[PDB]
């Protein structure tokens, strides 16, 4: 059963676990890509809450603003819309897109927005008949990134990227730096299963802020 | 030198379960240093979203009650941090003793942490007795040393307990669930800590979700 590595686009953090899982698979190591929503995980009306009380896919994609309204909610809901479509075209693009629009943002320094899509689009090598045809189903793509926000609630997902190793071991890796070498990859990914397979049952490594 | 500063309070069964780890380590070759870290300070109201301490521990008498929730740790650990530099007094093995007896009595005996703990982990130590009653006097001198630790853990950045200070710049809350004495696991466990802290990824963070 792979790895489930729930992320979100407006995280850097996410794009190198991302990135260090990309690389993984070569390696032998399965990964099922996943979306959190920081956003959504960030509000308010979420803090404290035994129940999630505002979804991000409950939000319209009109004009930016209104009551509730957060920063980067609007880039962020499309930008997994559109890698909800470019899923439909299966595994392999899926990481494409991913991989593609990630970098597009981090490494480009594009924002997530109509531009970027169509080009990370492109890069993944997706019909874009098809994707189009995917893209005007919002209502079915909603479904699935709902899907997505209930499993991570259901864990505690709180910060990107959290990887669910299964057997109740889940956890946020947040590291500074690129780590796409293989060999690095692997001592990386080594280090953090290593740590959350001890039997001395690690919960938290944590750096402060001088 | 070059001891690895170690961050606790007593109140906290995490704190506990890293000092043992580390007491154990000391005799593998690791070099560790106990300093102080209040939990009672640090989750204070006032302090909150503070990049400069507000309110601090040692101003508070040592009969002072605090408010409810956490806060109402507030005078167990105030007197038990000084009764632990108190302890200190005496060196090095006689602090490592007495703080290893008080968290025991608050954790495996399950005491209060109250002056019959204190007493208790004097003697079980092997304390000067009357040297420790001596130190005690000196209630204004143990509030500076602890004020000193709690300004040290401020300039670090310091939350929780226990916090380990590797030198370098390589500071992180160690957070694990199971007493881990034995000294083969003791050593598996620090070198996968020391690992992370010291991988070219800079490693900032690994923390379990609460499902």
Redesign the interface.
């Known amino acids: 059963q792979p790895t489930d590595l729930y992320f979100d686009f407006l995280s850097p953090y996410a794009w190198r676990g991302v990135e260090m899982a990309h690389v993984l698979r070569g390696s032998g190591e399965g990964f099922r890509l996943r979306h959190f929503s920081l956003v959504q995980g960030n509000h308010p009306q979420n803090k404290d809450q035994e129940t999630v009380q505002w979804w991000l896919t409950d939000q319209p994609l009109g004009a930016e603003g209104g009551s509730g309204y957060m920063k980067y909610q609007r880039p962020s809901l499309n930008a997994f819309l559109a890698a909800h479509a470019a899923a439909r075209q299966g595994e392999e693009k899926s990481w494409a897109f991913a991989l593609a629009l990630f970098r597009l943002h981090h490494e480009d320094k594009r924002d997530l927005d109509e531009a970027a899509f169509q080009d990370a689009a492109t890069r993944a090598g997706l019909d874009l008949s098809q994707w189009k045809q995917d893209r005007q189903d919002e209502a079915g793509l909603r479904r699935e990134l709902r899907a997505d926000l209930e499993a991570a609630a ?6 990107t990227p ?1 990887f669910d190793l299964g057997g109740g ?9 690129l ?1 796409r070498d293989p060999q ?1 990859a692997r ?2 990914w080594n ?2 299963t ?3 397979r ?13």
């Open positions: 259901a864990l505690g997902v709180f910060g959290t071991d889940v956890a946020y890796f947040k590291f500074e730096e780590t690095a001592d990386l280090l953090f290593s740590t959350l001890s039997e001395a049952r690690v919960a938290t490594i944590r750096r402060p802020v001088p």
